[PDB]
Structure formats: C-alpha cells, structure tokens
Amino acid sequence: ERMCGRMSDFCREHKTTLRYIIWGILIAGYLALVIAACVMNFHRALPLFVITVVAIFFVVWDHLMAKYESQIARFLSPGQRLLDSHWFWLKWVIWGCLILGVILWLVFDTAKLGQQQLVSFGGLIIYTSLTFLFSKHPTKVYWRPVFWGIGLQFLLGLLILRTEPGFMAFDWLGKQVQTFLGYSDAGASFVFGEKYTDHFFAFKVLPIVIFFSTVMSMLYYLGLMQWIIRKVGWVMLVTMGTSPVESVVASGNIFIGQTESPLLVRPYLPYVTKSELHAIMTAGFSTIAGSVLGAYISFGVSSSHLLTASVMSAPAALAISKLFWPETETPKINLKNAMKMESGDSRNLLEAATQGASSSISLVANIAVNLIAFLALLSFMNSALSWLGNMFDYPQLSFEVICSYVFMPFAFMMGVDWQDSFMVAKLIGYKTFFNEFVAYQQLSKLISLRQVGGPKFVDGVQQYMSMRSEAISTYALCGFANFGSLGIVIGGLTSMAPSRKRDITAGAMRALIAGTIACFLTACIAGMLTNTP
Amino acid sequence: ERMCGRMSDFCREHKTTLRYIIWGILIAGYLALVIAACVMNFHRALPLFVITVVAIFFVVWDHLMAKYESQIARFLSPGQRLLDSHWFWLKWVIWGCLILGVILWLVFDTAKLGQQQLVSFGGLIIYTSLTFLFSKHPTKVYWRPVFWGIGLQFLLGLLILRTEPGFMAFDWLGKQVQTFLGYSDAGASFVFGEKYTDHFFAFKVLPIVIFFSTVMSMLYYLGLMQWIIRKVGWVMLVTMGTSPVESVVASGNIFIGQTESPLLVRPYLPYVTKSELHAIMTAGFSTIAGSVLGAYISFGVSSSHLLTASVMSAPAALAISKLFWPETETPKINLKNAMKMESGDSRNLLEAATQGASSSISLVANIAVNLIAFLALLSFMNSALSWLGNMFDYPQLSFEVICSYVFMPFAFMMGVDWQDSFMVAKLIGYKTFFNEFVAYQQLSKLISLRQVGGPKFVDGVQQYMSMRSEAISTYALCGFANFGSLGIVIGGLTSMAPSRKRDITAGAMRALIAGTIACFLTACIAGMLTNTP
Amino acid sequence: ERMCGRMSDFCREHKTTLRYIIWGILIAGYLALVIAACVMNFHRALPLFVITVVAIFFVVWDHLMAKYESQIARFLSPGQRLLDSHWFWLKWVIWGCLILGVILWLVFDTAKLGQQQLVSFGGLIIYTSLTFLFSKHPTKVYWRPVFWGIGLQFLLGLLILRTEPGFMAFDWLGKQVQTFLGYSDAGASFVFGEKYTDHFFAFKVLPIVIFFSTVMSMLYYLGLMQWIIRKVGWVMLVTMGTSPVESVVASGNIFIGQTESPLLVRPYLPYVTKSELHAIMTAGFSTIAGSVLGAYISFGVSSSHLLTASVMSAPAALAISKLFWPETETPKINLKNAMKMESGDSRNLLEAATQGASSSISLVANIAVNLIAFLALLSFMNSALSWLGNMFDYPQLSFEVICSYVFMPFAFMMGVDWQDSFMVAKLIGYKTFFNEFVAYQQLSKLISLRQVGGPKFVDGVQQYMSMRSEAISTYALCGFANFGSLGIVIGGLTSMAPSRKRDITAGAMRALIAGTIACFLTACIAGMLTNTP
Ligand SMILES: CC(C)C(=O)OC[C@H]1O[C@@H](n2ccc(NO)nc2=O)[C@H](O)[C@@H]1O
Ligand SMILES: CC(C)C(=O)OC[C@H]1O[C@@H](n2ccc(NO)nc2=O)[C@H](O)[C@@H]1O
Ligand SMILES: CC(C)C(=O)OC[C@H]1O[C@@H](n2ccc(NO)nc2=O)[C@H](O)[C@@H]1O
C-alpha cells in the first residue's frame, strides 16, 4: 500500500489548499444556484437573494473591521480630541438641547394622546426615584448608565412602536417564530400518537421546549448566537459604559434562561466585583428564555410584544442594576477576555443536537412537577380563604381579590386606566407568587374572551380589558422574577463560583427586586407610547 | 443618604423590641378577627374557635413546661425515689394485678364475643413466640419493650374501636385527610388536560404523591410536623424504653413514607448501631404514607380502620424489632441531639415547596416502572401456570389458587373464619408479592360486592366475605413490606449513609419479615376486639 | 438456649447433605409431574416432555465434558499433531478444494437463479474489498477472521433459507418471542388505563423495553443467558480465531441491546486493547435487541428473516471489524476470565427484577426525547427543501427524493433490481439518519400495499416493491447504526470505563460505518440465496 501512503503524505502536505479549493467550489455552486433562481423568476427568488446579500455584507464588514481597526482608530482620534477639548461647553449645550427636545415631545405627543400616557411617564419617574432612594449607595451613583439605558429603551420604543418599518419588521419576525414553533408537532404526533391534542399541555407545549432547546444548542455550536451576542454587547458597552462582563451577560440573556446565561463567562466569575455579580443576576431575572417563547406564543400572547419586551429588557436590567447597586470598585476583566466565549465541548453538529435534546429532560420534568404542585396549592389556598371569609358572610374572599387590592398601585402607576388596573393587579400577583406561565395563561384567557366578543360586564363583574392594558401587561409580565426562582438561582451561582457564595446570598434578594422593577420600567415606556383605541 | 443610615441604625438599636411588638400586634389582630367572627355567629365560627383555643392551650403548655422544667423535676424526684425503694416487692404485686386483669378481661369479653376472637388471642401468642424463636440473639432479649408495645397497641385499639367518640373522631380525621388530598386534581387537570381521567393511575394517583411531597416539605420547613413528631415519640421513649433515634423515626413513619422517614435523623445516621438500623428499616416497612391514605379511602376501605392501623403499627413495629433483633451495644446518640431536627437548605417557604415537589420525580418514575414490570410478570406467570395445569385437566390453576392454600394458616391464626381465610390469604399473597395498592384494590372490589348485595355463593365460588374479615384484612394489609420494594429502600438508605452500606444490606431481609409480622400483630389485635356481625 | 446452638451446629455440619437432599427431592418431584402428565395424555404433554429431554441431555453433556476434559484432550491431541505435520502441503489442497467448490456452487446454483444473485455476490466482493481498502492498518491484516466470518454467514444462511425445517423452526421461534413480549401490554394496561392504545408509541412500545430489561436482568441473575452466550461464543472463538472478550460480546449482542451488552465484560473493560474496543462498539451497531423483535414482527416483517439477520450479523460485525481495524497488540484478558460473567449481586430474583426495571428509565426517556427532536428537525428540513426547490419550479424536492439518488448504488450492489433500488434507498436513508423503527414502519406499509393488492403504479410513482426486495431490505435494516444513537453509545461506554474515554470517542465513528457495512453483508448473502418470485 505504498501508493496510498504517498497519496496520504501529499494530501497532508497541501491539505489547506485542498480545503480552501473545496470551500470555494461549494461557495461558487451556491452562488450559481442563487443566481439561477433569480434568473428564472426574481420576484419569487427575492428572499434568497436578500439573505445572500445581507450575509455577504456582514462577512465583508467583519473582515474589514478586523483588518483596519487600528487605522480606523487613528483616523478617528483627532475628532475625539477636539470634542474632548470643547466638552466643557458642549456638554451644557447638549444637555439643554436634550431637555428641550424631551419637553417638546412630552407636551405635544403625550398631551395629544391623552392623560394615561402622561401618568405612565410619571410612573417611570416614580419608579426611578424610589429605586434610587433604596439604593445600596445613594451617594456613590454613576448617572451615565441610567440615562443611557432609559434613552436606549425610549429609542427602541420609538423605532418599533411608532414607525411602519420597525413595526412590520417585528410583526414579520414574530410570525416567523410562530411558524417555526409548529415543526415540533411532527415529533410530538409521532411519539404521542395522533391524539396528542387530547392532553394539550403535556403532549404539545413541552415538545416545543425540547425542539427549541435542541435548535438553540445547535446554533450556539455553529457560532451565530455568539455573533449576535457580541454585536449587541458592543453597542451596549459603548453607549452605556458598563463593564464588559455584565454587558455581554445582558446581551446573551435575551435568548437564554437565567441559569444558563452566566455560563457564557465562566472563567471570570470568581474575579467579578459585587456590582457586576448583582447586575448579572438582575439581567437574569428580568428577561425570559427564547426556548420557552414558543409556549407563550402558543397560548395566544402577541409575539410582537413579547419580542419587543425581550429586546427592551436588557437596557432596563443594566440601568436598574447600576442605579440600585452602584459600582464602587475597580473592574478586573477586559473586553478581549469577556467577548471570548468558551464554546461547548461538542465534536460535531449532531453531537451538539443530541446533547441539547438530552439536556431538556430535567427541564421538562421539573416544569411539569412544579406546575402540578403550585396549582394544587393555589386551589387549596382559594378553598381555605373562602372558608375563612364565609365566617363574615363574605364567601367570595380568595387569592384573586387580595392580589387585586394589593397590587393596584403598581398597575396604576404603569398607566393602566382605573378599571383595568385591578385585573392587571391579579396578573401581577400571579406572576409574582407563581411562575409567569400561570399569569400568561390567564392573560391568554382574557385576550381570548375579548376576541370572542361576548358581553363586557356580566352580573357587575368585568370580563375583559382594552387592547392597551393587554399590551402593558404583556410588557410587564415578560420575566422570570418570582420567589420560586430565587433559590434555584442562588445554587447555580454558587455552583459556578463557590468562593463568592458569601457575596451571592447578600445581593440575590436585591437582584430579584430589581428584576421586577426593570419589567415595570419597560411597561411604563410601553404605556407612554400606545394610544387609546 | 446619611439620614437613611441613621434611621436604619435607630431601627436596629430597638429592632428586637419593635419587631416583637409588631408581631404581637399581628397576633392580637388575628385574635380580634376570630372574636369578631364568633360575635357574628357562633355556629359557623365554631371550628375556628376550637382550633384557636387548642393552639393557645398547646403554646401556653409548651412555654410553661419549658420555663418550669427544673421545678417539675424537683417535685417529681421524691416520688420516684420512694417507688424505686419499694419496687423490690411492688413489682410482683403489679405483675400479678396485670395478669389478673388480662385474664378477667379475656374470659369475660372475648368469651362473650365468640370463639373467633379467642383464636385471635391465640394467634397473637403464636406470632410473638415465633418471633422470639427466630431471633438474632434469643439469650440477649429485653422484654420491657415487647410488653409495653403490645399494651399500647391494645389500649389504643380499646380506646378507638370500642368507644364511639373515638371511632367518630378518627372517621372525621380520615375524611379531612381525603378532602385535603383531593386538591391535587386541580393541578393534574391543568398539566394533563381535562381528559386526565382517561388514564386514571398515571394522571390521578401519581399527582397525589407529588402534592403530598410538596405539602410535607412545606410542613417540615415551617416546623409544624416536627412538633407532633416529638410529642408522639416522647410517650414511646418514656414508656417502652427504646432509643431516641429509633423512637423518633418510628413516630415519623406514621404519616411519612419509608423512603423519606430516615431524613429526620440524616446527620446521625452513620453512628446508629445495627439494632437501631434494623428498627429504622422495620418501622419504615410496617407503616404506610399519608398520601396513599387519601386514595385508599376512596376505594371503599374503612377510614377509621386505616387510621387506627397506621397509628398502631408504630408500637408494633418497635416491639417486634426489639424482640427480633435485640440490641447488644451501647448507643452513641443523645436524646437532645436525636430529637432536634433542622432543615437542610430552604431560604423561604416557596423554595421549600419547590424542593419538595422536585424530590418526587424519581419516586414516581420508579413506582410506575416497577408496577409495569411486576404486573407483566404476573400476567406471564398466570398464563404459564394455566398452560402447565392444562396437562392434568385443571386449567384453572393460577397464582391466586396457589396463594390461597399457601397463606391460609396466617389468615386462620389472625382470627378470620375458616371459609374466609382463603379469601384473605389471596389478598395477603397479593400484598406480599405485589405492592399493597393491588391488594387494596381487590379488597375494595370485595367490599363493593358485599355492599351491593346478592347471593353469597353464585356457585361453589364465594363472592364476598363478612364485615369482620374485611376489618381484619384492612388491618393486616396496611404496610409497605413487598419483595419489589425491598430494592429501592436499600438504594434509598445507602445514599444517606454510604459508610453503612455493608450493614444496610445485612438486615433488610429480616426487616421485611419483621414488618410483615408487625402488620399481622395489629391485625390479630383488631380481630380480637371486633365482634361478629 | 444451648440446645438450639447444638441443633444449629448439627445443621451446619449437615448443610451439604440437606441441600443435596432438597434438590434431589425437587428434581424427583418435577420428574414425577412429567411422568404423570405424559401418562394422562401424551399429546398434551409432548412439549413438556421435549423440554425435559433437551434439558437433561444438555446437563449430562455438560457434566461429561467438564469431568472428562483431560481424556478428551488426550484423544484429540495425536490427530491435531498429525494434521499440523501434514499441514505445510495440505493447506494448498484445502484452499483449492474450497475455491473449486465455491466456483461449482456459483455456476450450478446462482447462475440458474438469475442475474441479480450474481450481482449480489459481486456486491459482497465489492463491500469486502472496499472495507479492506479504507482500513486503519492495511498492511497488517489477519485474514482468518474474514474468510471464516463470511463462511459462517454463508453456511448459516444456506441452512436457514434453503431448508424448509430450518425456516419453519425460526418462524416458530419468532412467533414465540412475539407471544412472550405480548404480556408487557397487559402489564402496562393497568398503569396507563384501558385507553393506552390511543397513544401507541409512548404507552405500548416503551413498556416492551421495560419488560425486556427486567426479564433479561432476571435471566442474567439465574444464569441461563450466560450459558447460551458461552455456548455460542465458543463456536466463533474456535473457528474465526477471535479474542475471548470481543467474541463473548459479539455473541451476547444477538439478543441484547448495544447499551447493555458491555456489562457482560464490564470488569475487564478498561484493559481491552484498541481493536477489541472497536469490535465491542461495532458489534453493538449491527444487531437489534429482542425487545424490538416483537414490535417488528407485529408490523408484518418476516420473523425468520429478522432472526436470521441478527444471527448472521453476529459474525459479520467481528469479520468487518477485524478487516477494518486489525489488532496490533497482544490482548491482556484470559479466556477463563473473559468467559466468566459475574452473577448479579441482587439478594433474590425479585430484587434483580426490580433493579433491571429501574435501569431502563434513562433509556426510555432518551429514546423519546431524541425521537421528538430529530423528527422535528426532519420536518423543518423538509419544509426548507421544498421552499428552496420551489424557486426552480420543483416544489416536490424533499429528504426522500435526495436519499433516493444518494443511496441508490448501495441498494443496487446488494442485489436489488434497478426499479426497486430507489425504494430501498429511501428506507436505507431513513434507517441511517433516524432509528430503524421508522424505516421498518415504512417497509411495513410497503409490504401491506403489496399484500392488499392493486395497481403496481397508480401513477408515475411505484406503490410497492417485489418480495425479494422486501427480504433484502429486511436484512439490510436490522441494526442500531444511527447518527442519533452514537451519542448514547459513547455516553454508556465512557460511563462504564471512564479511563478509556480518550479512545472511545476516537473509535466511535469508524465503528458506526463498520456497523452498516456489516448489515449490508448480511443482505448480500441473503440476496445471493433467494430466488425471484
Ligand atoms: C415553559 C412554560 C411551559 C412554563 O410554564 O415554564 C415555567 C417556568 O419554567 C422556568 N424556566 C424555563 C426555561 C429556562 N431556560 O430555557 N429556565 C427556567 O427557569 C421558568 O422559571 C418559568 O417560570
Ligand atoms: C402508586 C403508589 C401509591 C403505590 O402503589 O405504592 C406502592 C409502592 O410505592 C412506594 N411508596 C409510595 C408512596 C410514598 N409516599 O407517598 N412513598 C413510597 O415509598 C412504596 O415503597 C410502595 O411499596
Ligand atoms: C422505541 C424503541 C423500541 C426503538 O425503536 O429503538 C430506537 C433506538 O433506541 C436505541 N435502543 C433501543 C432499545 C434497546 N434495548 O431494548 N437498546 C437501544 O440502544 C437504539 O439506539 C435505537 O436506535
């Protein structure tokens, strides 16, 4: 077999050239396919052409930025020097212009829309003031991140709610995610028979979790997920000035759960300051996981609002964390270390898919068991409360009434009208005490009732609420911040960073509160821009 | 900022006094609410008044006992000294009086009741003698625990079975337990849809286990369950004289499963002697968990008899363990250490509920898999036995037919009549070879047949059996002693105390037999006290 | 007291005699039962009499072989010495005779049958040559385990396929295996209700796996499975010249799953050489457990073909592994140690049954999760492929269409005619990418379409394929080689022998391919001996 050995040696000598040639040939074939499809009918082949164009543009941009970073910085330095020199008066000029513009927008637009939007703006101010008052170090507060976070949220709201392009873009994206979630039905139908719809939750909503986890793992292996994470994290880091580790964690948490978000930066956990740890936990609690987005979309919640709230919850988390537990130490991690994310230990794509699918057994089992236990407890609590209230000739007392009369101020400050604040209060209580899925199931119930068109009031009891209150509740409920999630978080952050355990338990509770406040802040900005039908 | 710190310092300085005043104010407010409810009506509000009064009595008694312990001991000491001084001659008088009393009670009551009751007494003597003969160390036997355990069982049975208020109270307790455990359906309907009734066992009974684990974890956290466990264990420790750790475990096993009961003394498990480990295993095997008690009462099994058997098994299990495997070494665990129980890791109530719910996944999976395997084996064994018995023109041969003749003597000695002894023996075989759920299902079928009415003998076969034999079967079947369940217990304990892996396996097989005989002793006593229809 | 000790001492002294008497009495009772059964009616008792005669014959044979081994070796040695003395020249005569017989058989038999069988023989030659060409160490290959492996495959296929009694015996065995596995359904009807048929896969098919696991655990404890495994493995070890441990594993894999097969030699697993590990992984990938035999016979696949396919894949895996990755170093496992399989530690039969049943939870959960994930990915891929194909006016493009043209040559070489090669290719692709369950489901549909009748081509698409192509596809698909099943194999082997984790992952992929080629070999021979309908 001498000839085989000689050929093997020759291939090893020029393996790189052969690989490059093969990849170029494949790329040429793909481009030929795309151009042929365009030739046959450009109108029908538009989406493929658009995808190809954007991919090529992004690849070229990345290559050019990698090649000429130093030269770009050298070119841009003189303008930075001039601006730094003129800052002493430019800062006053810019702040005055910003205040004038904000006042003009408030007066004109908000007054035109109505009183509720103005109340929402007031509620935003009140939330920021209160979270400032109970801040860990009120004196040692750095105000750049807070204002930049609120500004980013407001700009995202303006782009996505008050503009045709962004609104249509996010509607299309939500429709695509809804269409994508329908493919797990094939596997669920195979495994659980054609009657899997008889037990809707266990046999239809959990397979969605499994499929989304698998595809998420595959994407993380390929490297697209890290690409998007870096792209958003650079924007947040440049504009807000937060530390690289917390910024990357907040960017990554838009797609990942609270427990599996910190793993993006494992090695540097022991070396993070207290503020960065608290910011990590807050960003964990104030956003949801893309894997369970399918479950909420299944139940009739608006996918566009879910996506927009998830996008807007990162600046909110960072701003509220910086305000609540400000930085009083010197960060140790640098940008290069933080941006580098240690990929998983997967040999090939199919090993990644298998690992991702197998990892979700514990997720689904715990989800089901927790739902059973929590709803049984809820029914028992309702029965006991009714029994106790029957003593005073008031057998209607229940968890719902207490939640309605307890969380009313929070729902009102967000800008919900007086009548619907009580229903939003019930939803907020559901989210706070039980996981956010019960609350989203009841929101699905209410939105379905409104869509059916039945009578609004029956026996002096309101049945449904407006579209605006539904949007505000959609924004306010988009988070994992509930008491049950507290312990499971602490353990996780102790597992990765045992040496910091004494610190974690110190801030965990504070982090959870910040999480909810973050959600509320987004809802306020949602409430300030939506108009009354 | 400084003002906030000053206010916090001021609160901290008076933190104890202000906090105590606030909690007392809340308690006084609750008392005022109770008073208001009683004022509104005295019939509807009666149970709340009763529960409040009993709680006040117990808290007052507990605090008074704690404060004045030394005075009580000082007052008690002289009487104990006098009794010890005169015991040398008083012991014979006491023993003679007890023997005279038992003889008089037997010859009057049991002779009036009938011969079958006297056969139960004979069977009790036979079971105790057989336990003594096949004992690990017959020479080194401590007789006080045996006599005291049998006396406690007899006294409890005489108090409950032969007293109408006791019977009524225990029936009411069982009904409350059933109604409370019926709330799991609220969570099971949500998770498994409105069609959860279609797959009865899979989607109704296992949620009961999950919910019971959740509630039990919550109660262990709050510290309520440990209170009753200590109070019940104290009387056993004082009267029988068993060691503190085994008394605590035996008391805990009344309403906790065999798998979870040793967790009460988990820290001290490695230091337990062999005898105490055998007693732990036996006490676990003899008693059933509270979760299954909800299901069984639904099947038609008497509630009063189920509760009485569960309570009576603990003294029987301890007495049989002390007789079967007597202790021959000095214990190394103090009463204060053993009685004290501390929660592992539960930050708040909801973390405790979540952990309690997540701990039951392995339990439910193992239960389901063992049922599938063992019932498939039963079907195969029946088909093979019929095939083999077809050679002799007896195709009726099956598992039940052979078990009927194999286990007849135990049923006969327990007190059951001759004709019904075979019917009871079939159930005893079902319980010994398969979980108790199947045996209780068959017993419920027989109870339903008896209640509906009809011919006693449709043909040579007998349809149903008397009420007394159903009571005796209800007592004799109340245990977890199965061949199939022997494995997981060995798996369960070794995890808590791996260091004792050698010893755990040594005494498991004898612990299973001690549990079965413990069940049979309680059945013998129940058959002694019951009267023929 | 002392008398009991004296009796115990006497019992200890006479324990051997007591055990011998007990077993003699039991055997005599069994023989008396058999005699009575035969006397009463011989026709009814025939199957029991035959089983008794076979059992007693094997017991006597084993006793004679064990006791009189030395004399047998003494009588055999001189003949072996003479054979070795003459072998230097006898070698060429034996080889020439074998080649001449092969040529005469090929001319006289296959040529009469038709072209396709000759092509299948060519395909067998091509597959063996290709395996040799892409070999880890082509220069150092031992050719005994290839020629002998193919010889054993051909001989067994000839006996089973070209003789009616063998075909009928294997069909009967398949029917019995189906009947025996049928009891799992009756055992799972209790747990999953009477409506378990509604969810066919999850509820009917998995309990089959649980029942098979518990049954095989029982048999491993008793020791019949080990007896059969040794008996079969010795035939391979003496003839092919393979090592002991890998021969034992290959012989055990005939009726044991890939995950549970290494447990036979688990204690010696870390010391196995690299080639022995490769042959331990290949032999798993080319055989199906007995649990799926019942399901596949239920689908309508021929039972004789399934059993013959497994038995023939047993030698083929070893032959292909030895040609693919030849052994390069001396093994360190003795035959005596390798053959001995340590019995289960379970105290009694039911403990071992419980352990075996518990072990299967992970397996069933992983099967369900992987099926859901992979079928979802398949649906998404089909949608994407149709979307892409629509651009070129070809909306029919799908996974099946691509597989039909990708895998056609493999189907053609096996002997399938031209038109049916594409249909076989679709099944081959389904089996390679997803588990063989779906491939056999499609094959069952294709069998049923033929059995029902109807037009061969309802349109330009063929509905069903010939019977011979169904037999060839039955042989080709009988394996566990999947891209999704590689992960669990690696996870199991690393867990059993962590020390070798570096090597296992190195040798997994080459094993998977070596699995499929082995299956193809079993098909080629099956294609070579089968006459067209
Ligand atoms: C998904 C639907 C059916 C649902 O009801 O889920 C309830 C709870 O599931 C937790 N969860 C989920 C995903 C994740 N990472 O992907 N981490 C989590 O913690 C999270 O607390 C939520 O409330
Ligand atoms: C389906 C259930 C109710 C059942 O039939 O029980 C049979 C076996 O289930 C074990 N078991 C059950 C409940 C429990 N706590 O509620 N702890 C346990 O250990 C126990 O070993 C017994 O043998
Ligand atoms: C639903 C079941 C019966 C099935 O169709 O199996 C598909 C995949 O499940 C693996 N499997 C299965 C059974 C077993 N022992 O009984 N060992 C295994 O490894 C194996 O990888 C195969 O590909």
Core vs surface per residue B54-93: b (16+ CB within 10 A) or e: eeeeeeeeeeeeeeeeeeeeeeeeeeeeeeeeeeeeeeee
Sign of CA dihedral C6, C7, C8, C14: positive
What is the least distance, in Å, from the CA of A443 to any CA of chain C? 29
Best residue in A299, A362, A377 for a mutation probing chain B (most B CBs within 10 Å): A377
Distance spanning both ends of chain B, measured CA to CA: 82
DSSP one-letter string for C365-420:
HHHHHHHHHHHHHHHHHHHHHHHHHHTTT-TT--HHHHHHHHSHHHHHHTT--HHH
Nearest ligand 3 atom to alpha carbon C367: 9
CA distances from C316 to A464, C126, C226, C231, C521 (A): 69, 15, 22, 18, 7
Q: How far is residue A481 CA from its own chain's centroid?
A: 13
Query: In terms of CA atoms, which chain C residue is nearest residue A211?
Result: C373
Sign of CA dihedral B77, B82, B86, B91: negative
User: Measured between alpha carbons, how far is C123 from C108 in angstroms, rounded to an integer?
Assistant: 19
Nearest to C466 by CA among C150, C166, C114, C154: C114
Nearest to C244 by CA among C261, C268, C219, C227: C268
Nearest to A294 by CA among A383, A215, A189, A348: A215
CA distances from A439 to A400, A430, A477, A478 (A): 12, 5, 8, 10
CB C293 within 8 A of CB C309: no
Residue C210 Cα to ligand 3 midpoint, Å, equals 11
Nearest to C249 by CA among C285, C195, C302, C203: C285
Q: Write out the two tokens for A185.
A: 């039905």
Residues 6+ apart with CB under 8 A from B300: B444, B447, B448, B451
Q: Write out the two tokens for B335.
A: 């009463």
User: Measured between alpha carbons, how far is A262 from A490 in angstroms, rounded to an integer?
Assistant: 12
CB A371 within 8 A of CB B191: yes
H or E stretch covering B298? helix B290-298
Core vs surface per residue C248-274: b (16+ CB within 10 A) or e: bbbbbbbbbbbbbbbbbbeebbeebbb
Q: How far is residue C96 CA from its own chain's centroid?
A: 33
B432 CB within 6 A, ligand 2: no
User: Measured between alpha carbons, how far is A254 from A265 in angstroms, rounded to an integer?
Assistant: 15
User: Measured between alpha carbons, how far is C517 from C149 in angstroms, rounded to an integer?
Assistant: 14
User: Measured between alpha carbons, how far is B465 from B530 in angstroms, rounded to an integer?
Assistant: 15
User: Measured between alpha carbons, how far is C505 from C522 in angstroms, rounded to an integer?
Assistant: 27
What is the least distance, in Å, from the CA of B395 to any CA of chain C? 12
DSSP C462: B
User: Measured between alpha carbons, how far is A422 from A426 in angstroms, rounded to an integer?
Assistant: 7
User: Measured between alpha carbons, how far is B396 from A250 in angstroms, rounded to an integer?
Assistant: 71
Contacts of C383 in chain A (CB under 8 A): 183
CB C426 within 8 A of CB C398: no
Helix C206-222 vs helix C361-390: crossing angle, to nearest 10:
140
User: Measured between alpha carbons, how far is C277 from C271 in angstroms, rounded to an integer?
Assistant: 10
User: Measured between alpha carbons, how far is C183 from C211 in angstroms, rounded to an integer?
Assistant: 9
User: Measured between alpha carbons, how far is B462 from B469 in angstroms, rounded to an integer?
Assistant: 14
Q: How many CA atoms lie within 13 A of C357 on its CB side?
A: 28
Nearest ligand 2 atom to alpha carbon B208: 16
With H, G, I as helix, E, B as strand and everything else as coil, classify residue C137: coil
Distance spanning both ends of chain A, measured CA to CA: 81
Q: A201: exposed, middle or buried (C-beta count within 10 Å: 0-12, 13-18, 19+)?
A: buried
User: Measured between alpha carbons, how far is B193 from A203 in angstroms, rounded to an integer?
Assistant: 10
User: Measured between alpha carbons, how far is C516 from C521 in angstroms, rounded to an integer?
Assistant: 9
CB atoms within 10 A of CB C421: 23
With an 8 Å Cβ cutoff, is A506 touching chain B?
Answer: no
Nearest to A341 by CA among A284, A269, A264: A264
Residues 175-204 of C with CB under 8 A from B: 180, 183-184, 186-188, 190-193, 195-196, 198
Residues 6+ apart with CB under 8 A from B340: none
Which protein residue's CA is at the shortest distance from atom 21 of ligand 2?
B485
Q: How far is residue C335 CA from its own chain's centroid?
A: 22
CB atoms within 10 A of CB B395: 13
Mutate to test the pocket of ligand 3, among C297, C369, C432, C435 (most ligand atoms within 8 A of CB): C435
Residues 6+ apart with CB under 8 A from C64: none
CA distances from B366 to B201, B325, C209, C290, C362 (A): 14, 30, 15, 23, 11
CB A252 within 8 A of CB A317: no
Asked if B348 and A486 come within 8 Å (Cβ–Cβ), the reply is yes
Q: What is the 3-state secondary structure (H, E, C) of A175-220?
A: HHHHHHHHHHHHHHHHHHCCCHHHCHHHHHHHHHHHHHHHHHHHHH
Q: Write out the two tokens for B236.
A: 């056993």
Q: How far is residue C16 CA from its own chain's centroid?
A: 41
Core vs surface per residue C439-478: b (16+ CB within 10 A) or e: bbbbbbebbebbeeeeeeeeeeebbbbbebbbbbbbbbbb
Domain positions in chain A are: 9-67
**Resolution of this entry in Å?**
3.2
Q: C239: exposed, middle or buried (C-beta count within 10 Å: 0-12, 13-18, 19+)?
A: middle
Contacts of C193 in chain B (CB under 8 A): 198-202
User: Measured between alpha carbons, how far is A244 from B307 in angstroms, rounded to an integer?
Assistant: 63
Residue C205 Cα to ligand 3 midpoint, Å, equals 11
CB A110 within 8 A of CB A528: yes
Q: Write out the two tokens for A158.
A: 């303006």
CB atoms within 10 A of CB B217: 26
Q: What angle do CA B411, B417, B423 make, to 5 degrees?
A: 55
B485 CB within 6 A, ligand 2: yes
User: Measured between alpha carbons, how far is C99 from B207 in angstroms, rounded to an integer?
Assistant: 69
Mutate to test the pocket of ligand 1, among A437, A441, A488 (most ligand atoms within 8 A of CB): A437
Task: Look at the block and give the residue holding tokens 């709803």.
Answer: A375
User: Measured between alpha carbons, how far is C39 from C43 in angstroms, rounded to an integer?
Assistant: 10
CA distances from B364 to A125, A373, B201, B204, B213 (A): 51, 14, 11, 12, 11
User: Measured between alpha carbons, how far is B168 from B162 in angstroms, rounded to an integer?
Assistant: 11
Nearest to A306 by CA among A146, A473, A481: A473
Rg (CA), chain A: 26
CB A413 within 8 A of CB A122: yes
Core vs surface per residue A262-282: b (16+ CB within 10 A) or e: bbbbeebbeebbbbbbbbbbb
User: Measured between alpha carbons, how far is C143 from A73 in angstroms, rounded to an integer?
Assistant: 68
Chains A, C: CB contacts within 8 A come to: 103
CA distances from A384 to B31, B40, C153 (A): 18, 19, 73
Residues 6+ apart with CB under 8 A from A203: A188, A192, A196, A197, C199
Contacts of B214 in chain A (CB under 8 A): 373, 376-377
User: Measured between alpha carbons, how far is B222 from B232 in angstroms, rounded to an integer?
Assistant: 18
Task: Look at the block and give the residue holding tokens 């009036």.
Answer: B112
Measured from CB, residues less than 6 Å from any atom of ligand 3 are: C 205, 209, 212, 257-259, 289, 291-292, 367, 435, 437, 480, 482, 485
User: Measured between alpha carbons, how far is B266 from B220 in angstroms, rounded to an integer?
Assistant: 14
With H, G, I as helix, E, B as strand and everything else as coil, classify residue A344: coil
User: Measured between alpha carbons, how far is A269 from A228 in angstroms, rounded to an integer?
Assistant: 22
CA distances from B181 to B175, B213, B516, C390 (A): 10, 11, 27, 58
What is the least distance, in Å, from the CA of C142 to any CA of chain A? 16
Q: Identity (one letter) of the amino acid at A200?
A: F
